[PDB]
Coordinates of C-alpha atoms and ligand atoms in Angstrom, one line a residue:
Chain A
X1 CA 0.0 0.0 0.0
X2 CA 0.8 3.2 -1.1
X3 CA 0.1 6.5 1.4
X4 CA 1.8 9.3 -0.9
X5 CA 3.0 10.1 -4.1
X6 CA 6.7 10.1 -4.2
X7 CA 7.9 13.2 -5.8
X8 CA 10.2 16.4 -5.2
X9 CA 10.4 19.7 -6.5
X10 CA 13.4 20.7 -8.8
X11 CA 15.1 23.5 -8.8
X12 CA 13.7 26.1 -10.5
X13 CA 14.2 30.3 -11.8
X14 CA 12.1 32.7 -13.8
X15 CA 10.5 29.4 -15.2
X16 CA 13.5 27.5 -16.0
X17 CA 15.1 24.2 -14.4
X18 CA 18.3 22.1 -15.1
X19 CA 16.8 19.4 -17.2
X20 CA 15.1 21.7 -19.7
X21 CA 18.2 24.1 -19.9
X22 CA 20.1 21.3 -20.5
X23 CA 18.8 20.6 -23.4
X24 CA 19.3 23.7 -25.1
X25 CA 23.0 23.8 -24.2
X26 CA 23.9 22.3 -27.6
X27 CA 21.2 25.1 -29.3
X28 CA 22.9 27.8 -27.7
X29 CA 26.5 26.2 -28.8
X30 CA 24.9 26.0 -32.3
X31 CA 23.9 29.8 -32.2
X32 CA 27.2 30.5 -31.2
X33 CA 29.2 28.9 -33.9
X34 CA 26.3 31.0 -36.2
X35 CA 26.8 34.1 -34.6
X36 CA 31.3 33.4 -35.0
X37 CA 31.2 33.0 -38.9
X38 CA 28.2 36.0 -39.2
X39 CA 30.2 37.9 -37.3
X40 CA 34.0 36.8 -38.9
X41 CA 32.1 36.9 -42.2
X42 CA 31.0 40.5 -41.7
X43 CA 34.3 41.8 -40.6
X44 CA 36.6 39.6 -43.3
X45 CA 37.1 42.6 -45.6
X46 CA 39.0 44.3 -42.1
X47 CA 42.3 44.1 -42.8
X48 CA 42.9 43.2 -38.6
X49 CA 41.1 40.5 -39.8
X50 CA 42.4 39.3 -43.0
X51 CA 46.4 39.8 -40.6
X52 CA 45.8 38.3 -37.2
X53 CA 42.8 35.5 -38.1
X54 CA 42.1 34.3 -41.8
X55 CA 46.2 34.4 -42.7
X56 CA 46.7 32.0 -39.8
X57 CA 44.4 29.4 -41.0
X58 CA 46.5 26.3 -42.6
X59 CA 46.3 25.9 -46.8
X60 CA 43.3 28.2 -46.5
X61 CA 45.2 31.2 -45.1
X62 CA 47.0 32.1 -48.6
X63 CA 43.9 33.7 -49.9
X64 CA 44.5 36.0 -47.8
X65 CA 47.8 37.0 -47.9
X66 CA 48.0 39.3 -51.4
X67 CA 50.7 41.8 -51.9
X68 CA 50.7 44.8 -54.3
X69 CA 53.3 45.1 -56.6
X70 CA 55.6 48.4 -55.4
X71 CA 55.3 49.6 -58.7
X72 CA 51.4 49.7 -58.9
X73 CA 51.1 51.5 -55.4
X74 CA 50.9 55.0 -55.2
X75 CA 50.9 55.1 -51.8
Chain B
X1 CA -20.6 -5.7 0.3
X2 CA -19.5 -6.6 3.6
X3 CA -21.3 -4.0 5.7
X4 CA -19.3 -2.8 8.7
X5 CA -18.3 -0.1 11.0
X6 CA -15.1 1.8 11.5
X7 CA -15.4 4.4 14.4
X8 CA -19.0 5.5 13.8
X9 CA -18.7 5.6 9.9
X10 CA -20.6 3.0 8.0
X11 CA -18.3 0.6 5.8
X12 CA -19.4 -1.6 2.7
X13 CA -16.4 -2.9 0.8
X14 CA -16.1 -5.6 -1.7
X15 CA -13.0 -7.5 -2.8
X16 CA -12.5 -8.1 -6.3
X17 CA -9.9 -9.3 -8.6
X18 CA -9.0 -6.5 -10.2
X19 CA -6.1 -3.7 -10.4
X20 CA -8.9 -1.0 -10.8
X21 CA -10.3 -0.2 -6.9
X22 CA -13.2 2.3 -6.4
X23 CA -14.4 4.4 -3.4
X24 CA -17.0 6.3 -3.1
X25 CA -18.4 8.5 -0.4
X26 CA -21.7 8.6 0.0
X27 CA -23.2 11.4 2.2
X28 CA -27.0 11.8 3.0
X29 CA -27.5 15.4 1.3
X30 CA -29.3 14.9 -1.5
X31 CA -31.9 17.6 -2.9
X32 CA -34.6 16.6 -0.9
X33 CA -32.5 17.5 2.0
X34 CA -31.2 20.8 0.8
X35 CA -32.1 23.4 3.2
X36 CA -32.1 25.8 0.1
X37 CA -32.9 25.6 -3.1
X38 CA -30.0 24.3 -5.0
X39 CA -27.1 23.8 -1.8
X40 CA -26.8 19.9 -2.6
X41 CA -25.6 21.0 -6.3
X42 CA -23.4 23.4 -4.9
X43 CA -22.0 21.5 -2.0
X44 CA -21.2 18.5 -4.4
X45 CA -19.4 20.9 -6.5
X46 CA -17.5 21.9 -3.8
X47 CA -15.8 18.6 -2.7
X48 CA -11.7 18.4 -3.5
X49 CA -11.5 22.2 -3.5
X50 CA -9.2 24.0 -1.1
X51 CA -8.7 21.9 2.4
X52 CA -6.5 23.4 4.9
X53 CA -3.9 20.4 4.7
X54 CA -4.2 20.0 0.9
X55 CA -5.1 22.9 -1.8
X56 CA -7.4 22.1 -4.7
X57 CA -4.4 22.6 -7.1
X58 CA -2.1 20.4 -5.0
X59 CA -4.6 17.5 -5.1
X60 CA -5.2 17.2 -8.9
X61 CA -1.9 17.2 -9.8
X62 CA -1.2 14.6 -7.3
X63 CA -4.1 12.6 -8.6
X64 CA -2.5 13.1 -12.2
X65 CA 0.2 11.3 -10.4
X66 CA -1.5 8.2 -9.3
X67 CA -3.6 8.3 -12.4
X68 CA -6.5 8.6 -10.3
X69 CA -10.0 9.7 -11.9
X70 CA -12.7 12.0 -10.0
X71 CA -16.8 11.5 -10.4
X72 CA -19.3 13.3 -8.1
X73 CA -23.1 14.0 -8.4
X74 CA -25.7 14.9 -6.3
X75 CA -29.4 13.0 -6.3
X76 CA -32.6 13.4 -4.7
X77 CA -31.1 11.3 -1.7
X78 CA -27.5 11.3 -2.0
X79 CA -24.5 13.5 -3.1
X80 CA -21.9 10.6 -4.3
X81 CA -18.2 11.0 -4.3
X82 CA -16.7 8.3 -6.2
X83 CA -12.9 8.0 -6.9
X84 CA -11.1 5.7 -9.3
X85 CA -7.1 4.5 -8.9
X86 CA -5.2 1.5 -8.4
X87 CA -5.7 -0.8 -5.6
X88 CA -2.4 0.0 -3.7
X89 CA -3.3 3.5 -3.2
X90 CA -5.9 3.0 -1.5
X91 CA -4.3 5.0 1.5
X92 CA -4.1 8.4 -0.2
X93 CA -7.9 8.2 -1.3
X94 CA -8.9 7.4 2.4
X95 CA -7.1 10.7 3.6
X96 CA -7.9 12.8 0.7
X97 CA -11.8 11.9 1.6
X98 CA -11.2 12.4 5.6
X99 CA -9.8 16.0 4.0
X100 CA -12.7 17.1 2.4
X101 CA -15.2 16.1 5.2
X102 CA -13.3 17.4 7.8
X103 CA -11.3 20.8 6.6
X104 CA -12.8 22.1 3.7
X105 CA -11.8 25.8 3.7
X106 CA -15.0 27.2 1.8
X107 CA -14.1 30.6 0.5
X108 CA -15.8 33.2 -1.5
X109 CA -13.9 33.0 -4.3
X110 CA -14.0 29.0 -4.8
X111 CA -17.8 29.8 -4.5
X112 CA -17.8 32.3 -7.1
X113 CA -15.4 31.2 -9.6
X114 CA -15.1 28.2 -9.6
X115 CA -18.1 26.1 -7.8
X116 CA -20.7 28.4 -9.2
X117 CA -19.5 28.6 -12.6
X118 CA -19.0 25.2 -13.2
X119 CA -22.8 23.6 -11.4
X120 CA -24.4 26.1 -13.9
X121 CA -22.2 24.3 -17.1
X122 CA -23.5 21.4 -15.5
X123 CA -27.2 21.7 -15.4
X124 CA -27.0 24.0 -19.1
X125 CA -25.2 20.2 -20.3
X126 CA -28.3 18.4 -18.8
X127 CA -31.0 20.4 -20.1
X128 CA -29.7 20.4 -24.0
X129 CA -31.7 17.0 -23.4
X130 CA -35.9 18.4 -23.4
X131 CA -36.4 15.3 -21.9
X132 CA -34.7 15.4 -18.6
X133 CA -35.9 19.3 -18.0
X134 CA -39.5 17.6 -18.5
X135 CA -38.9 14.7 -16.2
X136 CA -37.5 17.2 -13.7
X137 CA -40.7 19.4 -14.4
X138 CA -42.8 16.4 -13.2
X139 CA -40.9 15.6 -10.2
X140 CA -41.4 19.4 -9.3
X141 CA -45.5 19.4 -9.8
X142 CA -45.9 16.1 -8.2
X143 CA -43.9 16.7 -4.9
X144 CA -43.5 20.3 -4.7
X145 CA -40.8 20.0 -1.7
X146 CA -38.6 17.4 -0.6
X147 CA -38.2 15.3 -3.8
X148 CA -39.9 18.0 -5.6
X149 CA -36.7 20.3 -4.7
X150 CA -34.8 21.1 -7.9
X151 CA -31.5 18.7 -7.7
X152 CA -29.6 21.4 -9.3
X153 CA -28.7 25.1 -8.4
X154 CA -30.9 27.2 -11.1
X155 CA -30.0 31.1 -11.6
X156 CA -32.9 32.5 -10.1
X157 CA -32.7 31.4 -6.6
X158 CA -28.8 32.2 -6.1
X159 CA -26.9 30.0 -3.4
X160 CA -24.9 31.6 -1.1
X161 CA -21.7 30.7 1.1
X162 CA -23.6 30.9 4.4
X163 CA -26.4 28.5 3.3
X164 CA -23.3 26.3 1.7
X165 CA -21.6 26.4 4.7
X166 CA -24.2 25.1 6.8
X167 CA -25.3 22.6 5.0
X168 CA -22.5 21.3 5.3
X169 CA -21.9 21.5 9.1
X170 CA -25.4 19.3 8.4
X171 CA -24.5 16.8 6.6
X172 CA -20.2 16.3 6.7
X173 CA -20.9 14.4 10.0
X174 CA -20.3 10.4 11.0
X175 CA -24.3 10.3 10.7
X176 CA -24.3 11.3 7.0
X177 CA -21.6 9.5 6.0
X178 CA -21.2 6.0 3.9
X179 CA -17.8 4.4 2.8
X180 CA -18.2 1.7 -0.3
X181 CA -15.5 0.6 -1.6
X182 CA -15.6 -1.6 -4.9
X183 CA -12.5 -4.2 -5.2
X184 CA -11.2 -2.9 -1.9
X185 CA -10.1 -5.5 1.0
X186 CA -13.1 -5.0 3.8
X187 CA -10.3 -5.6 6.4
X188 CA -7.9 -3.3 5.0
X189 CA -10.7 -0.8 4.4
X190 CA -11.9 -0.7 8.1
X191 CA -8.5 0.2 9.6
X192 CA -7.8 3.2 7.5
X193 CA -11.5 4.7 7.7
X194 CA -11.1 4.2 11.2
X195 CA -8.1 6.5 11.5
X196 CA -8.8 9.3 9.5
X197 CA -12.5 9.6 10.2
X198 CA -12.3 9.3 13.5
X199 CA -12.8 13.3 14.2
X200 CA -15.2 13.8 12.3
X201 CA -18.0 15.1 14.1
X202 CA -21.4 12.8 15.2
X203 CA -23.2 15.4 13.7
X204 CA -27.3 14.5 13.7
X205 CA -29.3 12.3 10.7
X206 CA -30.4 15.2 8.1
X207 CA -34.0 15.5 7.4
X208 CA -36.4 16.4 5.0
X209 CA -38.4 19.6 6.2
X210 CA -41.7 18.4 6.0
X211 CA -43.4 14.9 4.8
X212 CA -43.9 14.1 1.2
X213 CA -47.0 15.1 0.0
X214 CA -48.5 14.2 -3.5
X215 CA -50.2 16.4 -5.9
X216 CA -51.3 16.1 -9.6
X217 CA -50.9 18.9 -11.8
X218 CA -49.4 20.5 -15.2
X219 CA -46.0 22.2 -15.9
X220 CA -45.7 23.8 -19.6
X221 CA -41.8 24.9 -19.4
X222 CA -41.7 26.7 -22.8
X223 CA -38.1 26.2 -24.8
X224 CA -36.8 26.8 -28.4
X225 CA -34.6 24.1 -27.5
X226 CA -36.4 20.5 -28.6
X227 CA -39.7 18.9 -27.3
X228 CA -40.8 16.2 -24.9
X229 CA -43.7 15.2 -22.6
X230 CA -43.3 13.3 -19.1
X231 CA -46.7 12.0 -17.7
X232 CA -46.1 10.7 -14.4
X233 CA -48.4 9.1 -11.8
X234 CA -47.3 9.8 -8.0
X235 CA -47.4 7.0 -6.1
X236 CA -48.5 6.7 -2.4
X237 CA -47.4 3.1 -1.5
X238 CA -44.0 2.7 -3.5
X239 CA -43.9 -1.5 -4.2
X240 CA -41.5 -3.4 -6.7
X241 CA -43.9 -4.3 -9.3
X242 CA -44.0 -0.9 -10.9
X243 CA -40.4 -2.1 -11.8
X244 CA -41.7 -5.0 -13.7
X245 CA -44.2 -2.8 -14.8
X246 CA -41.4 -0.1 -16.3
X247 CA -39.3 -2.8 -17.9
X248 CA -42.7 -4.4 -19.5
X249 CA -44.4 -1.4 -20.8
X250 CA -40.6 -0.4 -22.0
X251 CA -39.8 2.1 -25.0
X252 CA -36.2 1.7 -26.0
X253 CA -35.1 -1.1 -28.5
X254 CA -33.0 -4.2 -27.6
X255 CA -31.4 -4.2 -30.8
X256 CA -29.8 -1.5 -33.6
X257 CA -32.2 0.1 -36.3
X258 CA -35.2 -1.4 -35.0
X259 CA -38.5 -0.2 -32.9
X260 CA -38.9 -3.0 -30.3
X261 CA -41.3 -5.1 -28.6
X262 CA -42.4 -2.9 -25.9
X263 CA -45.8 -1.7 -25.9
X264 CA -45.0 1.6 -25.6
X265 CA -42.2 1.2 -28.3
X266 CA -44.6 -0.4 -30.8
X267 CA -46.2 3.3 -30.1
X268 CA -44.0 5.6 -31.8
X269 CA -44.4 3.5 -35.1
X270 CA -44.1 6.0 -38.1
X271 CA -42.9 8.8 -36.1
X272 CA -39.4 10.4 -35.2
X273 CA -39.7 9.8 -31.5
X274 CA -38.2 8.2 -28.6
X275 CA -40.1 6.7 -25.4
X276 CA -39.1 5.8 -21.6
X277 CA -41.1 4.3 -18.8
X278 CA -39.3 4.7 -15.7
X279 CA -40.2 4.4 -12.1
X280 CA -38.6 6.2 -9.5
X281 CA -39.0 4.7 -6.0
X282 CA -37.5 7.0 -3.2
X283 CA -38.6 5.0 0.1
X284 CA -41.9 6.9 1.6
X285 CA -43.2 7.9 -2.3
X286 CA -42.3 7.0 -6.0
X287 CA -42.9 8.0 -9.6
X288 CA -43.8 5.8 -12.2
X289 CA -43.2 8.1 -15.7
X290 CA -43.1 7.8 -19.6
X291 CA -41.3 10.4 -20.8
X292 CA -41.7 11.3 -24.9
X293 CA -39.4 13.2 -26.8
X294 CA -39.5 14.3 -30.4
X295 CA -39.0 16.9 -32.9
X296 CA -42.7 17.5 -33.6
X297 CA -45.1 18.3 -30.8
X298 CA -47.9 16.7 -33.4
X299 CA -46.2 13.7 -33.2
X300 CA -45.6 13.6 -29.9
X301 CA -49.0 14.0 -29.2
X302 CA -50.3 11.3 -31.1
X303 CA -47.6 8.8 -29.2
X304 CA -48.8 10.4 -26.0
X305 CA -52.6 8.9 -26.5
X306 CA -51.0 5.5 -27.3
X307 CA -48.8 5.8 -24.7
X308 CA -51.9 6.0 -22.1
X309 CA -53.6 3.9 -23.8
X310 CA -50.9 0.9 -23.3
X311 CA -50.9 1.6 -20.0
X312 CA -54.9 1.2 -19.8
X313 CA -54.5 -2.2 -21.9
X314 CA -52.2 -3.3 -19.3
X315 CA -54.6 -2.7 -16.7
X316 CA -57.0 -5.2 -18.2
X317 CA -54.3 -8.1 -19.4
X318 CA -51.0 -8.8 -19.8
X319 CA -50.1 -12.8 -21.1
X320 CA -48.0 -14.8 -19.3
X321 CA -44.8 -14.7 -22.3
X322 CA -45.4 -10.6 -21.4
X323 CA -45.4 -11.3 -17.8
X324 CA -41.8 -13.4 -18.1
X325 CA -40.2 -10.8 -20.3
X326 CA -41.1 -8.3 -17.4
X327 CA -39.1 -10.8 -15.2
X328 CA -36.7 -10.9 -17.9
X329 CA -36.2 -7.3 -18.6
X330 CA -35.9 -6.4 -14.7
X331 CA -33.7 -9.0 -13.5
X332 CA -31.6 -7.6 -16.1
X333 CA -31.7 -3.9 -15.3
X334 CA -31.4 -4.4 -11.9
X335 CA -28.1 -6.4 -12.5
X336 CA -26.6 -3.9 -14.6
X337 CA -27.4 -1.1 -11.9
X338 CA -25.3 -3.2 -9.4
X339 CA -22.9 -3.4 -11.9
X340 CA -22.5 0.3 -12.9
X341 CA -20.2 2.0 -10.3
X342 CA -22.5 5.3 -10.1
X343 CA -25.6 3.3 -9.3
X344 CA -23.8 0.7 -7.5
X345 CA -22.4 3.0 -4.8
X346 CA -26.1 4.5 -4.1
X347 CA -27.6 1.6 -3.9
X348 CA -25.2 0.2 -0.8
X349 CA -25.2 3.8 0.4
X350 CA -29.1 3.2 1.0
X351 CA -28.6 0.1 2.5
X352 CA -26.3 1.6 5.1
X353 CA -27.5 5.2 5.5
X354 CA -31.5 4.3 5.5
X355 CA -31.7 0.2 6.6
X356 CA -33.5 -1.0 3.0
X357 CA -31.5 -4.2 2.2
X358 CA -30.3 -4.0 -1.1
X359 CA -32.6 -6.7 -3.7
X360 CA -29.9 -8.6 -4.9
X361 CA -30.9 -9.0 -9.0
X362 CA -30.8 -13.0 -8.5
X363 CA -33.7 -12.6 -6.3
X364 CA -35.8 -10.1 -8.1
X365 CA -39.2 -11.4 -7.7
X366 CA -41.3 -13.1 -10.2
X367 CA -44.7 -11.0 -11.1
X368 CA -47.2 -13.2 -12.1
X369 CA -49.8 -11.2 -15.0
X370 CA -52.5 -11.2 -12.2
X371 CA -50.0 -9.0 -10.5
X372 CA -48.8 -6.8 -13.4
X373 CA -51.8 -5.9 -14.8
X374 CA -53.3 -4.8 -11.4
X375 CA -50.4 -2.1 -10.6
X376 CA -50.9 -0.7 -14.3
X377 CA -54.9 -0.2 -13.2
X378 CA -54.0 1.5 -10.4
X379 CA -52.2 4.0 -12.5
X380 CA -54.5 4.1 -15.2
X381 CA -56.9 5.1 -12.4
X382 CA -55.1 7.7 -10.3
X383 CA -56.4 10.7 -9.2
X384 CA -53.3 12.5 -9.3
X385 CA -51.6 12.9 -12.8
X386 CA -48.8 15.1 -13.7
X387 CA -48.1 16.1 -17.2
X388 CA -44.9 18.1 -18.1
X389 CA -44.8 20.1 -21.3
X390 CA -41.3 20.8 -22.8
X391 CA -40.5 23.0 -26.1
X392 CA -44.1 24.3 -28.1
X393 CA -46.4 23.9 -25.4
X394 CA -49.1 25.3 -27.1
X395 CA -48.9 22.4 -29.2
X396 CA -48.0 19.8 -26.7
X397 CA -51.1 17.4 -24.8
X398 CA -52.7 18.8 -21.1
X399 CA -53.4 16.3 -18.6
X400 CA -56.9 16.7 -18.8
X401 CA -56.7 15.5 -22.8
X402 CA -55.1 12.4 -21.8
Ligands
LIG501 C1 22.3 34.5 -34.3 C2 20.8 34.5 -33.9 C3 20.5 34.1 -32.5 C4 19.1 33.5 -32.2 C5 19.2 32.8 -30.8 C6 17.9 32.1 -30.2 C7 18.2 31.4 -28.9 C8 16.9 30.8 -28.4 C9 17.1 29.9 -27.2 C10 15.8 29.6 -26.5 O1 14.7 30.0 -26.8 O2 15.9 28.7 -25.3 C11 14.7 28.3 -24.6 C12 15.3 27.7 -23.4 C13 14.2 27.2 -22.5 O3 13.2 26.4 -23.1 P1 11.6 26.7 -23.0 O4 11.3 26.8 -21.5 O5 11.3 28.0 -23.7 O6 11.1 25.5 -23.7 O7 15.9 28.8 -22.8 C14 17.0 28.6 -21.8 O8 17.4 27.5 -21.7 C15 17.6 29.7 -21.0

């Protein structure tokens, strides 16, 4: 015989608990890896960029690295 | 149903062989009781709302937990408390009902939204049927008070939380109070009642103001909503043939797209319309009625002569093949009322409120024609008939036509 139900409370904050967030940690790792390349993508033309990030990145990275010819630059 | 006692509380528990237990509370505040006009709804609506150890909200969703299931209703005699779960929690349904009897918090705001809002869906549900508004029409004319109480609360006569509230001081007392308890161990059943009933007060046996008095009469309760016609006969001396008699003179069909044997079947030949002989014993009176409903009050009409008519054919003779399909019919109706968990737990809770040992349906008695047709003279020949009009009344029968 059974006097109660066996349960407990979780938990909880503004509507949220442990096993629900948990399951939008990988989401949230998702969006962030989305928001990265936007964001990388958006600023690729900066030439900060091009030196310190896309230059660095192996067999890819030459697209990046383009020289002017001395004679062709005014400047 | 082993009938017992468990510290002042009447017990009647079955055991079974089942996973599936049921309890039911039955408590002697039906309408017929109802100090006011309407309390017996309202008090039934108000069981398993807000008790000081246990909130309304905490107790469903703990039921959600042990899959448990909630039925209530209220009667002429009874308000019935019935809960479904599985047989090892029987503990929790013990204390739950010990909660409710005992330390029901009955606030204002329960009463107004939530008890009151929810007993008027519940009587707007019934009455979409014409034919139990005119059956409720005819207890109404015939009785006037006591059984002739509505059993539900109406808008006109408004139900407040004093007269709730003191009703129930009436009736949630050891004296009012029946435990059945279908597939439950009667040992196991004793011992928990026994514990968390035990302060419940003695309380006093509720009565019905007044003695039941019979009256004939008309009630033409005008609608837009369908059309039907009870025509009931009060009766003085309630006896068990006018069971027989219902289950003989009939109306419904045994059998899918067909009319039926019944006399009063065999009268609604050629027309869109349903029949019901029912009899209605409540101890000290009863109420033998055929109740019509149809979509034209012509037609209607027309079954409504054959119907009396049947009844007036009983009177003079009834063969002895009618007479063993009466026997037939009611050993069988009484068997599936025993059977039916609603019934079932009214039935016991009569046994043990009033003292009227249940008929057990094997032992239904055998009504021999002599027998028959003599209880449908005496209602051919009553001095008291009650006709209730429902829908186009102008167009419906008066008592004095039939
Ligand atoms: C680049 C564009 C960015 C779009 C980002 C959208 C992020 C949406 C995340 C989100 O809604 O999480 C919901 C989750 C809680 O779940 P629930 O309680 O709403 O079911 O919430 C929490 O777990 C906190």
């Amino acid at each position: 015989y059974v006097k109660k139900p066996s349960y407990k409370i979780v938990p909880h904050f503004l509507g949220f608990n442990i096993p629900t967030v948990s399951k939008w940690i990988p989401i949230f790792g998702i969006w962030g890896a989305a928001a990265g390349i936007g964001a990388l993508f958006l600023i690729e033309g900066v030439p900060r960029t091009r030196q310190d990030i896309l230059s660095k990145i192996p067999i890819i990275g030459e697209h990046w690295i383009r020289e002017i010819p001395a004679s062709d630059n005014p400047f | 149903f082993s009938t017992a006692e468990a510290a002042g509380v009447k017990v009647a528990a079955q055991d079974g062989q089942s996973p599936i237990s049921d309890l039911s509370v039955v408590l002697r505040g039906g309408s017929r009781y109802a100090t006011v006009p309407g309390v017996s709804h309202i008090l039934e609506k108000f069981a398993f709302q807000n008790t000081v150890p246990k909130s309304a909200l905490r107790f469903v969703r703990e039921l959600e937990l042990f899959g448990g299931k909630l039925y209530t209703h209220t009667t002429r005699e009874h308000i019935v408390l019935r809960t479904q779960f599985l047989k090892q929690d029987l503990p929790y349904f013990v204390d739950a009902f010990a909660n409710v009897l005992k330390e029901t918090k009955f606030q204002q705001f329960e009463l107004t939204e939530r008890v009151a809002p929810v007993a008027e869906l519940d009587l707007l549900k019934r009455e979409s049927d014409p034919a139990f508004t005119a059956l409720e029409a005819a207890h109404e004319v015939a009785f006037r008070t006591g059984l002739g109480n509505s059993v539900y609360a109406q808008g006109y006569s408004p139900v407040t939380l004093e007269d709730v509230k003191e009703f129930a001081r009436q009736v949630y007392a050891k004296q009012n109070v029946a435990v059945v308890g279908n597939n439950v161990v009667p040992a196991d059943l004793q011992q928990l009642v026994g514990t968390a009933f035990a302060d419940l007060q003695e309380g006093s046996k509720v009565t019905q103001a007044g003695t039941t008095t019979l009256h004939g009469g008309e009630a033409r309760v005008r609608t837009s909503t369908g059309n039907a016609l009870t025509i009931a006969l009060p009766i003085a001396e309630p006896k068990p043939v006018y069971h027989a008699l219902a289950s003989f003179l009939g109306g419904p069909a045994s059998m899918p797209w067909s009319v039926g044997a019944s006399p009063l079947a065999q009268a609604t030949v050629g027309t869109h319309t349903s029949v019901k002989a029912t009899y209605h014993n409540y101890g000290d009176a009863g109420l033998f009625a055929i109740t019509i409903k149809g979509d034209s009050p012509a037609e209607i009409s027309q079954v409504a002569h054959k119907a009396v008519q049947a009844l007036k054919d009983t009177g003079a003779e009834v063969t002895e093949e009618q007479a063993a399909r009466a026997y037939a019919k009611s050993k069988f109706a009484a068997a599936e009322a025993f059977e039916n968990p609603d019934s079932s737990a009214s039935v016991i809770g009569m046994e043990l409120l009033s003292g009227v040992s249940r008929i057990a349906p094997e032992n239904v008695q055998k009504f021999t024609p002599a027998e028959l047709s003599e209880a449908a003279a005496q209602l051919s020949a009553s001095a008291k008939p009650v006709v209730a009009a429902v829908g186009q009344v102008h167009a419906l029968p008066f008592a004095d036509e039939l």
